[PDB]
Amino acid sequence: MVEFPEGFVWGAATSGPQTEGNFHKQHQNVFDYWFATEPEQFDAGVGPDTASNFYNDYDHDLALMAQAGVQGLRTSIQWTRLIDDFETASLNADGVAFYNHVIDSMLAHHITPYINLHHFDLPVALYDKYHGWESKHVVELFVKFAEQCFKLFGDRVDHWYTFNEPKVVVDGQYLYGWHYPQVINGPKAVQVAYNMNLASAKTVARFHELCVRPEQQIGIILNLTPAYAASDDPADLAAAEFAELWSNNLFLDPAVLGHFPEKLVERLTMDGVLWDATPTELAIIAANPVDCLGVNYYHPFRVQRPDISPKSLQPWMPDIYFKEYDMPGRMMNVDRGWEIYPQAMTDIARNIQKNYGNIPWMISENGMGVAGEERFLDKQGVVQDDYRIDFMKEHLTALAKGIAAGSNCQGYFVWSGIDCWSWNHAYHNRYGLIRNDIHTQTKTLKKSAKWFAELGERNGF
Amino acid sequence: MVEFPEGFVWGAATSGPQTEGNFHKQHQNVFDYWFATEPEQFDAGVGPDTASNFYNDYDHDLALMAQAGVQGLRTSIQWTRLIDDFETASLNADGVAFYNHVIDSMLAHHITPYINLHHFDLPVALYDKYHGWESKHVVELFVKFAEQCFKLFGDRVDHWYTFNEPKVVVDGQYLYGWHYPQVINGPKAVQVAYNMNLASAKTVARFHELCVRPEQQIGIILNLTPAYAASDDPADLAAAEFAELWSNNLFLDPAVLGHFPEKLVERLTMDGVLWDATPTELAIIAANPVDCLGVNYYHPFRVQRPDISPKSLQPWMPDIYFKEYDMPGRMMNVDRGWEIYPQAMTDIARNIQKNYGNIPWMISENGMGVAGEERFLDKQGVVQDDYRIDFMKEHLTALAKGIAAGSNCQGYFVWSGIDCWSWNHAYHNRYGLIRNDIHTQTKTLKKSAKWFAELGERNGF
């Protein structure tokens, strides 16, 4: 009924910090320091120290993912596990052995590796010493980390990503208190956003200097949720277009077009908060756009005029130009508090084909979180997560209008394969195709796993 | 009878390691370490620990130089004095205070500062830890240190130089045994020569991001002695061709034209000794040529065919393509071993005018050395150094020819103002317009000093 192009990749997505646990990890990332210092900030007091036991059970975990039909698995390498000395990027031996064990095990179970380099997991010591992503030195240290990954695993990994959603690091660490160090400072957030795009372009450059095969591509993973206007009222349209530029063009334009959006640059310049860039750095951005693009989508975003004039006496924040809008009539996932709107899939697909040269791209994250999935166990202990099947059917159907109209969309990656640790929310909401009983780290396929496996065999539903 | 353009600058040239002494210097450069462990390698046992006492006596020393007609003093800031932590380029407080005193004292004596950032004085710890200029990381540390110099002193310093004769570091440290660490490795020296051209271009880029005046200019100091063919025989013209590419084009073309000489790159590639470069690096080199040129010249250089074929089995060295030639009938400075040939001054001027856009340039070093000048002391303790006047006269007369033919030469700096420490030769040969008795650090003008002052007021002789 719905068919997908030949060679379409059917995948799942996690990260190292949300799965491995901290077993024998040399360094703390910001979340490990946060958890070890303020465990009360975490749901049920579950921190990342054990997560989903992937450090210990990766092999059998991969067997289960392959049964659920994971053809390609995307996860991440922790800067804080691979690296001994950050200034030098020397190798922690156990960390190197672990990631090789993981990659080899993926290829033993016929799972194609998709490796991302950074998923919100800055080493706390680099924050302490340089304030992390605010420091162009830390940007250089990341490239050095990235080179070590290219040299150690490039013989077996064709598909690479620099960052997963830099904007969430920008928002979490410097705007809204989501991430340790919980800084609230607009001007610093602007500098961080620039520095991460710069880290990204530098890593693409280093990758293309070292890559030997045509199959080897490096991309970036962004959330491209559109910023839908609340109404056709002019103040709402003005709010929607800044929020579009701020949330999407801020990273999409430099990563894919090689430049920042000039209207955004103009606005930050006039507000006095523009980042510090050099001509060399800008030239590096222009010269090293990504090969491909990972797209994350879960729920839409709608905006209206700000309550007060942006000329008001207040600390600068991107939010002075827009406020979120809840739409009367919205279809809702009520317990998670998110609108369901799979047509965003189709709009995103078209933005990419019309305004970004139809660059090769994939849905790298799409999924639905539900709390207390033990309510829906059947008598053999399998979650009857039909809601998650329905969810995937709605978003894939819109994605197929996506591809039928021309989108160079090359795969679909579910968040997630195995239930994994969602930062402060920990295991409140489960997204997996595969349940994890985190007390015993016992993993069981849910119903959606078998449907996802047949989806990949039929190449449709 | 022989006069110069309006506003021609009459200056003197030294460097920091040859004048200051090591008084309260936090770090050893390469020569400090070399002397501290092998003083027998240094003439009469004299190292750089006191030199010409400039750390203590800069004020009165600057008065004597002004008495001798020094309108512009070119010297250097030592990396090892200014910088506490090389990795961060944090400041040593006594080092900053000293160079502030020196620059301020220069102005109070009406001497225009010309500041060179590097004169063969690699910090020895960066050699031990990274192998120094071989490490593109050391390149980045240099840029950081250069930024500090601009930020601290740019407000009163308009004339900057990235390096003095990078080729002498390549030759001295990696080819012929002149400089600690005394490595003898052809391929390494090629990479070092690449890295210092890169470091210079990166330093031009940082200067221009931070320069706040039209008057502020940065350049590089190069010896541009022509490579004279021993004869018009093809084999001698071919050797002179390569020695010219290797001696001058290797630094001049990147610095002024923004690219390496493709004939040289062809030759090194064919010989498999080419440097490792990146597209990014070559673009920085292309984008930041110097503002001006400083030209060093003391004696000519003549070249014939190698004794044996370059296809012979021998370690790759630039010299496989050319041998130094001794012309019969040459005018010699016999004690020093150098030929006297002021006509080269004219040749240099014309080469810049005709093949380098007539970019603004100066003779930044020219001068004659003479051992044991006590022989020519008179009743006054004044060295009767008529030979140095004759030398200056002859080479100035050739310069004026170049100028009248239209070469954009704008000044002429004598080496040196005060007798200074000439590396392993230390104080064997004396070059100053002003003598230093190095036992008492008592400094007294020579006859040539008064004449240089009269040369300035008359703008000619």
B147 is catalytic: no
Alpha carbons within 13 angstroms on the beta-carbon side of residue B233 total 8
Virtual torsion, Cα B383, B386, B390, B393, nearest 10 deg:
70
- In terms of Cα–Cα distance, which of B153, B29, B24, B22 is closest to B94? B24
Number of other residues whose CB lies within 10 A of the CB of residue A386? 13
Measured between CB atoms, which of A205, A278, A279 is closest to B280? A205
Number of other residues whose CB lies within 10 A of the CB of residue A360? 16
Round to whole Å and give the CA distance between A172 and A165.
Answer: 11
Answer for the pair A364, A13: CB distance below 8 angstroms, yes or no. yes
Alpha carbons within 13 angstroms on the beta-carbon side of residue A186 total 14
Residues in chain B: 461
Round to whole Å and give the CA distance between A225 and A169.
Answer: 17
| Start-to-end CA span in chain A (Å) | 6
Q: Could you give phi then psi for residue B305, rounded to 5 degrees?
A: -50, 145
Q: What is the CA radius of gyration of chain A?
A: 21
Q: If residue A371 lies in a helix (H) or strand (E), which one and from where to where?
A: strand A370-371
Burial of B426: CB neighbours in 10 Å, binned 0-12, 13-18, 19+: buried
- In terms of Cα–Cα distance, which of A30, A1, A70 is closest to A434? A70
Would you tell me the crossing angle of helices A343-355 and A386-404 to the nearest 10 degrees?
30
The sign of the CA dihedral A293, A61, A423, A240 is positive
Map residue A338 onto helix, strand or coil.
Answer: strand
Residues in chain A: 461
Residue type, B390: D
Q: Which residues of chain A are within 8 Å of residue B284 when distances are taken between CB atoms?
A: 280
| Tokens, residue B368 | 């004659």
Round to whole Å and give the CA distance between A80 and A83.
Answer: 6
Round to whole Å and give the CA distance between A260 and A286.
Answer: 9
Round to whole Å and give the CA distance between A34 and B308.
Answer: 70
CB-based contacts of A355, cutoff 8 Å, min separation 6: none
Pairing of strands B301-304, B323-324: antiparallel
Give the single-character DSSP code of A91: B
Q: If residue A458 lies in a helix (H) or strand (E), which one and from where to where?
A: helix A447-458
Q: How many CB pairs under 8 A join A and B?
A: 21
- In terms of Cα–Cα distance, which of A286, A139, A144, A289 is closest to A208? A289
| Start-to-end CA span in chain B (Å) | 6
CB-based contacts of B273, cutoff 8 Å, min separation 6: B186, B187, B190, B316
- In terms of Cα–Cα distance, which of A326, A282, A449 is closest to A382? A449
Alpha carbon of B175 to those of B133, B250, B301: distances in Å?
14, 15, 18
Answer for the pair A187, A170: CB distance below 8 angstroms, yes or no. no
Round to whole Å and give the CA distance between B292 and B255.
Answer: 9
Q: Spell out the alpha helix ranges (H) of A38-165.
A: 54-67, 79-82, 93-108, 124-130, 136-153
Nearest CA in chain A to B204: A280
Map residue A443 onto helix, strand or coil.
Answer: strand
Resolution (A): 2.5
B228: left (phi over 0), alpha (psi -120 to 50) or beta: beta
Alpha carbon of B373 to those of B36, B434, B438: distances in Å?
28, 11, 13
Are B283 and A279 a contacting pair at CB < 8 A?
A: no
Nearest CA in chain B to A284: B280
A165 is catalytic: yes
Are B287 and A287 a contacting pair at CB < 8 A?
A: no
Virtual torsion, Cα A273, A276, A280, A286, nearest 10 deg:
-30
For chain A, how many helices (H) and strands (E)? 15, 17
**Whose structure tokens read 């308009």?**
B158
Q: Which residues of chain B are within 8 Å of residue A283 when distances are taken between CB atoms?
A: 283, 287
Experiment type: X-ray
Number of other residues whose CB lies within 10 A of the CB of residue B124? 21
Of residues A134, A165, A244, A373, which has the active-site annotation? A165
Of residues B20, B134, B244, B365, which has the active-site annotation? B365
Alpha carbon of B314 to those of B174, B187, B235, B308: distances in Å?
17, 13, 20, 10
Q: Spell out the alpha helix ranges (H) of A176-233.
A: 186-210
Map residue A419 onto helix, strand or coil.
Answer: coil
Burial of A311: CB neighbours in 10 Å, binned 0-12, 13-18, 19+: exposed
Residues paired with B219 in a beta bridge:
B161, B292
Alpha carbon of B174 to those of A360, B134, B345: distances in Å?
48, 10, 29
Round to whole Å and give the CA distance between A374 and A389.
Answer: 17
CB-based contacts of B190, cutoff 8 Å, min separation 6: B268, B273, B274, B275
Burial of A283: CB neighbours in 10 Å, binned 0-12, 13-18, 19+: middle
- In terms of Cα–Cα distance, which of B404, B409, B227 is closest to B321? B227
Pairing of strands A323-324, A301-304: antiparallel
Round to whole Å and give the CA distance between A187 and A170.
Answer: 11
Round to whole Å and give the CA distance between B426 and B419.
Answer: 10
Pairing of strands B370-371, B429-430: antiparallel
Give the single-character DSSP code of A433: S
Round to whole Å and give the CA distance between B442 and B322.
Answer: 45
Nearest CA in chain A to B207: A278
Round to whole Å and give the CA distance between A48 and A30.
Answer: 11
Round to whole Å and give the CA distance between A66 and A453.
Answer: 8
CB-based contacts of A75, cutoff 8 Å, min separation 6: A13, A14, A15, A16, A19, A114, A115, A116
B441: left (phi over 0), alpha (psi -120 to 50) or beta: left
Q: Which residues of chain A are within 8 Å of residue B283 when distances are taken between CB atoms?
A: 283, 287
Secondary structure, 3-state, chain B: CCECCCCCEEEEECCCCCCCCCCCCCCCEHHHHHHHHCHHHCHHHCCCCCCCCHHHHHHHHHHHHHHCCCCEEEEECCHHHHECCCCCCCECHHHHHHHHHHHHHHHHCCCEEEEECCCCCCEHHHHHHHCHHHCHHHHHHHHHHHHHHHHHHCCCCCEEEEEECHHHHHHHHHCCCCCCCCCCCHHHHHHHHHHHHHHHHHHHHHHHHHCCCCCCEEEEEEECCCEEECCCCHHHHHHHHHHHHHHHHHHHHHHHHCCCCHHHHHHHHHCCCCCCCCHHHHHHHHHCCCCEEEEECCCCEEEECCCCCCCCCCCCCHHHHCEECCCCCCCEECCCCEECCCHHHHHHHHHHHHHCCCCCEEEEECCCCEECHHHHECCCCCECCHHHHHHHHHHHHHHHHHHHCCCCEEEEEECCCECCCCHHHCCCEECCCEEEECCCCEEEECHHHHHHHHHHHHCEC
- In terms of Cα–Cα distance, which of B174, B60, B69, B15 is closest to B441? B60
CB-based contacts of A41, cutoff 8 Å, min separation 6: A34, A35, A424
The contact set of A with B (CB < 8 A) is 87, 140, 205, 209, 278-280, 283-284, 287
Are B280 and A284 a contacting pair at CB < 8 A?
A: yes
Measured between CB atoms, which of A140, A209, A278 is closest to B278? A209
Q: Which residues of chain B are within 8 Å of residue A143 when distances are taken between CB atoms?
A: none
Least Cα separation, residue A281 to chain B (angstroms): 10
Q: What is the CA radius of gyration of chain B?
A: 21
Round to whole Å and give the CA distance between A394 and B350.
Answer: 76
Would you tell me the crossing angle of helices A186-210 and A136-153 to the nearest 10 degrees?
30
Nearest CA in chain B to A210: B278
The sign of the CA dihedral A414, A419, A420, A423 is positive
Round to whole Å and give the CA distance between B16 and B417.
Answer: 13
Residue type, A400: A
String of b and e for B59-83 (b: at least 16 CB within 10 Å)?
Answer: eebbbbbbbbbbbbbbbbbbbbbbb
| Tokens, residue A297 | 């989508």
| Tokens, residue A241 | 């277009």
Q: Which residues of chain B are within 8 Å of residue A278 when distances are taken between CB atoms?
A: 205, 209
Q: Which residues of chain B are within 8 Å of residue A280 when distances are taken between CB atoms?
A: 205, 284, 287
Answer for the pair B446, B368: CB distance below 8 angstroms, yes or no. no
Interface with B, mutate which of A138, A143, A211, A280 (most B CBs under 10 A): A280
Round to whole Å and give the CA distance between A93 and B302.
Answer: 56
| Tokens, residue B182 | 């005394």
Map residue A432 onto helix, strand or coil.
Answer: coil
Measured between CB atoms, which of B140, B278, B283 is closest to A283? B283
The sign of the CA dihedral A441, A444, A448, A454 is positive
Answer for the pair A386, A449: CB distance below 8 angstroms, yes or no. no
Give the single-character DSSP code of A322: -
Are A209 and B140 a contacting pair at CB < 8 A?
A: no
Answer for the pair A139, A202: CB distance below 8 angstroms, yes or no. yes
Alpha carbon of B101 to those of A419, B56, B96: distances in Å?
66, 11, 9
Measured between CB atoms, which of A87, A140, A280 is closest to B205? A280
Are A287 and B280 a contacting pair at CB < 8 A?
A: yes
Answer for the pair A92, A152: CB distance below 8 angstroms, yes or no. no
String of b and e for A90-123 (b: at least 16 CB within 10 Å)?
Answer: ebbeebbebbeebbebbeebebbbbbbbbbbbbb
Of residues A20, A244, A281, A365, which has the active-site annotation? A365
Interface with A, mutate which of B136, B147, B280, B285 (most A CBs under 10 A): B280
Q: If residue A400 lies in a helix (H) or strand (E), which one and from where to where?
A: helix A386-404
Alpha carbons within 13 angstroms on the beta-carbon side of residue A241 total 11
Q: Which residues of chain A are within 8 Å of residue B278 when distances are taken between CB atoms?
A: 205, 209
Are B283 and A287 a contacting pair at CB < 8 A?
A: yes
Map residue A300 onto helix, strand or coil.
Answer: coil
CA A396 to chain centre: 19
Domains contained in chain B, CATH given: 1-461 (3.20.20.80)
Residues paired with A76 in a beta bridge:
A116
Pairing of strands A301-304, A72-76: unpaired
| Tokens, residue B269 | 């590639």
The contact set of B with A (CB < 8 A) is 87, 140, 205, 209, 278-280, 283-284, 287
| Tokens, residue B242 | 């390569």
Q: Which residues of chain A are within 8 Å of residue B199 when distances are taken between CB atoms?
A: none
